[PDB]
Amino acid sequence: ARIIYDRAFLMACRGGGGENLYFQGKHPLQNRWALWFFKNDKSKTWQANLRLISKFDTVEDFWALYNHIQLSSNLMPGCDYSLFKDGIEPMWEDEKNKRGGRWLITLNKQQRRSDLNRFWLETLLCLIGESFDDYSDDVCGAVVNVRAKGDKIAIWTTECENREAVTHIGRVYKERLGLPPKIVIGYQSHADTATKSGSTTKNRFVV
Amino acid sequence: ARIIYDRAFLMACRGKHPLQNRWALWFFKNDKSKTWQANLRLISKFDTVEDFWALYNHIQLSSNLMPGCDYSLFKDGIEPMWEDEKNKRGGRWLITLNKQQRRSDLNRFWLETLLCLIGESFDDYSDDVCGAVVNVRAKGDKIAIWTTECENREAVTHIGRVYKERLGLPPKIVIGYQSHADTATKSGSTTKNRFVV
Ligand SMILES: CC[C@H](O[C@H](C)CO)c1ccc(-c2ccccc2F)cc1NCCO
Numbered sequence A: 001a002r003i004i005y006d007r008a009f010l011m012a013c014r015g016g017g018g019e020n021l022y023f024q025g026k027h028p029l030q031n032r033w034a035l036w037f038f039k040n041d042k043s044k045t046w047q048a049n050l051r052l053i054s055k056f057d058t059v060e061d062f063w064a065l066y067n068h069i070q071l072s073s074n075l076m077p078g079c080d081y082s083l084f085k086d087g088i089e090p091m092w093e094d095e096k097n098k099r100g101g102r103w104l105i106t107l108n109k110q111q112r113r114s115d116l117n118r119f120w121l122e123t124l125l126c127l128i129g130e131s132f133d134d135y136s137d138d139v140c141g142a143v144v145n146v147r148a149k150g151d152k153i154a155i156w157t158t159e160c161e162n163r164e165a166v167t168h169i170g171r172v173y174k175e176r177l178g179l180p181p182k183i184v185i186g187y188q189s190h191a192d193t194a195t196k197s198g199s200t201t202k203n204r205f206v207v
Numbered sequence B: 001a002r003i004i005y006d007r008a009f010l011m012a013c014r015g016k017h018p019l020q021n022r023w024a025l026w027f028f029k030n031d032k033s034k035t036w037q038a039n040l041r042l043i044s045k046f047d048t049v050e051d052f053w054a055l056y057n058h059i060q061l062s063s064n065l066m067p068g069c070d071y072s073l074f075k076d077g078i079e080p081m082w083e084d085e086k087n088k089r090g091g092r093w094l095i096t097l098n099k100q101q102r103r104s105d106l107n108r109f110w111l112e113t114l115l116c117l118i119g120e121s122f123d124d125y126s127d128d129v130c131g132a133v134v135n136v137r138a139k140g141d142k143i144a145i146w147t148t149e150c151e152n153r154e155a156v157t158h159i160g161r162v163y164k165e166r167l168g169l170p171p172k173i174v175i176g177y178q179s180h181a182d183t184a185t186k187s188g189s190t191t192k193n194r195f196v197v
């Protein structure tokens, strides 16, 4: 049976406390997850800029990692963070992303201060909590691109032709973000996003 | 929980199973026309048993063995240079192959070394492993496991003992652990060993 945590449960497991007696007191995740960082440098190759930070598979180890990064880390533009299921690289060329795409939220300059941290955490909860019912199996991961022009947050899914999975992910995600129903989010095939065709990329789906 | 694969398991996964660590394969060469950083090339990274074997099977089919060249597999975020923050206080267990041992032992010992790394073969003391280097040379090839701290005797000697076991070296063939700080100093014909097994 799928391990599913709602938003309230994940939030109550936060701040630590549990003794983890018998190694049996932590709350297991459905999936193991890997946190990645990708910098920009004096042309290091794409592989040399992509770094694995940490992996986890309990609610408590998620929060120790989240609380740590929140206390310790700086927010540099040009950088990207990704949380992906164990064994999927955060690159669209990966077997599990090549046929896929992303549900994209773009924030303007002003919304860095107000919405970036909030929307990123809400995104992470959706992933580790298995919030999309059977369609959570279609999730690969989520990416945050920290940029001067405006930040991007996206959930990556495995198959852009699975309309029922994709649209359900998008509905629940927009709901969990608490976006106004007139803020429309768009799902972009990685194959279209890889092609630079001018102004904007095509949306396969919108919610 | 720690991800440990014995030698039989890794061999049966060959032609996904996650590795404890992500690993980076590097290529380097002693050309003078170019600065050291121009000679250090990053080939690929991986973090599953299957992606290790796709990379190993590829390099085994495709690549040529040129002397003067070095290959290195290091944990993600450690450069294969003794000046790195994770190698500067460290050293290496060293296996020198003589000229005839190239044809017979280089490929075998290099693979057995790689299995020790990706499989986490040293129990808690695999956290002390930084990587492994192969120096392909005319005089005789060198294979070494690099560890992070030459003063961690219990970690170092356990690595050395399990490594010599996994290489199937006879107990008469003694391997030596050399601090990077001594190996950086040229003091004559060989370097001092901090430990021996
Ligand atoms: C520098 C902090 C960075 O900020 C983002 C861009 C906005 O929030 C960031 C990156 C990764 C994670 C992270 C942590 C645990 C699991 C998975 C993760 F992606 C958390 C944070 N920061 C949260 C608090 O600001």
Ligand SMILES: CC[C@H](O[C@H](C)CO)c1ccc(-c2ccccc2F)cc1NCCO
Pocket: B025, B052, B055, B056, B059, B060, B063, B064, B065, B066, B071, B072, B073, B106, B107, B108, B110, B111, B114, B134, B136
């Ligand atoms: C010439 C190929 C070279 O040969 C060594 C020196 C002796 O063996 C070499 C280098 C790297 C790797 C390698 C591949 C995947 C992950 C990590 C690695 F270090 C494999 C090989 N050779 C395999 C076949 O012998």
